[PDB]
Design a protein around this ligand. Structure first.
Ligand SMILES: [Cl-]
Ligand SMILES: [Cl-]
Ligand SMILES: [Mg+2]
Ligand SMILES: [Mg+2]
Ligand SMILES: [Mg+2]
Ligand SMILES: [Mg+2]
Ligand SMILES: [Mg+2]
Length: 314
């Protein structure tokens, strides 16, 4: 006979603050399932009238969007209301959301660039919007937060910013970008990553490489990605390009193939709106105007539509 009981469930007395987290060098959801980001960057802070981009990005099959914010150091600060709206729209569309402060880009070289400390203060100002969204939102402290001048200087302020966010009570997975405009040409992030990782007492830290023309051969791509995997350190390709520019030709084929082989995340740059539209996946924010680059990223080998799996939390 069935026990025939009729109970109702109270929610667990104790639950973890962390949602998305790191386990054994990989990104995992709260339920333990491995998560491999396959997504797109959207320049929200510069295109407030293009928020339909989030739903259009989901329609590609993408499982993640990286949303460009400003902390007001250089561009126009994204308000807590705006950020709350974006997070909720991403959740409604079943997208994981990587938020990033762009104003740090090129610090130490570009005189208009802000500090990681200023970015951290901005994140702390968003705490009431962000707390409770640890299953859904990854905090990328500052985009490409050092230029090419003295990239060794990146390690101390990166470490300090992580510690400042943890001391403020953040339980999200935190993502950090490399010096040399995100491409880590001098290898400072690659060398110092373990030290930086060990400085996050939660272990919930992921490194992000941006692969442009420095990564113009197969060997350069595979060496970098394998370096992190072999060291047991979590990594994604948080931006990448592909079409040749004045500095070389990024090897997008090897990036995407190796990301698939190793199960590392990637986020293509970008949906639309670049000053030079060569990296626009769609022209004029219009899904019916895919560019050559859009065709490659969405529909080509190891691309988004082929490989992206929705986060299981949804
Ligand atoms: Cl706009
Ligand atoms: Cl080479
Ligand atoms: Mg029964
Ligand atoms: Mg939970
Ligand atoms: Mg909306
Ligand atoms: Mg060094
Ligand atoms: Mg290329």
């Amino acid at each position: 006979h069935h026990h025939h009981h009729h109970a109702i469930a109270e929610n667990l007395y104790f639950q973890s603050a962390a949602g998305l987290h790191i386990s054994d060098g990989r990104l995992v959801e709260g339920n333990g399932n491995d998560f491999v980001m396959r997504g797109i960057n959207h320049a929200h802070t510069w295109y407030p009238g293009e928020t339909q981009s989030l739903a259009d990005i989901k329609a590609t099959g993408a499982n993640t969007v990286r949303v460009v914010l400003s902390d007001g150091y250089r561009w126009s600060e994204n308000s807590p209301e705006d950020v709350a709206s974006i997070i909720a729209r991403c959740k409604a569309e079943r997208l994981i959301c990587v938020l990033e402060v762009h104003d740090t880009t090129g610090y130490g070289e570009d005189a208009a660039a802000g500090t990681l400390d200023h970015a951290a203060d901005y994140w702390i100002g968003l705490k009431d919007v962000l707390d409770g969204e640890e299953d859904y939102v990854v905090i990328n402290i500052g985009n490409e937060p050092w230029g090419n001048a003295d990239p060794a200087g990146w390690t101390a302020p990166t470490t300090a910013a992580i510690q400042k966010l943890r001391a403020a009570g953040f339980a999200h997975t935190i993502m950090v970008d490399a010096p040399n405009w995100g491409q880590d040409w001098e290898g400072v992030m690659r060398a110092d990553a373990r030290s930086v990782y060990d400085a996050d007492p939660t272990g919930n830290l992921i490194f992000s490489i941006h692969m442009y023309s420095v990564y113009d051969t197969a060997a350069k791509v595979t060496d970098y990605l394998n370096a992190f995997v072999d060291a047991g350190l979590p990594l994604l390709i948080g931006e990448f390009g592909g079409p040749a520019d004045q500095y070389g030709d990024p090897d997008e084929d090897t990036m995407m193939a190796t990301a698939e082989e190793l199960g590392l995340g990637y986020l293509a740059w970008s949906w639309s709106g670049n000053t030079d539209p060569v990296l626009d996946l769609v022209l004029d924010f219009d899904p019916t105007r895919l560019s050559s680059w859009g065709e490659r990223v969405l529909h080509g080998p190891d691309g988004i539509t082929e490989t992206s799996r929705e986060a299981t939390v949804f």
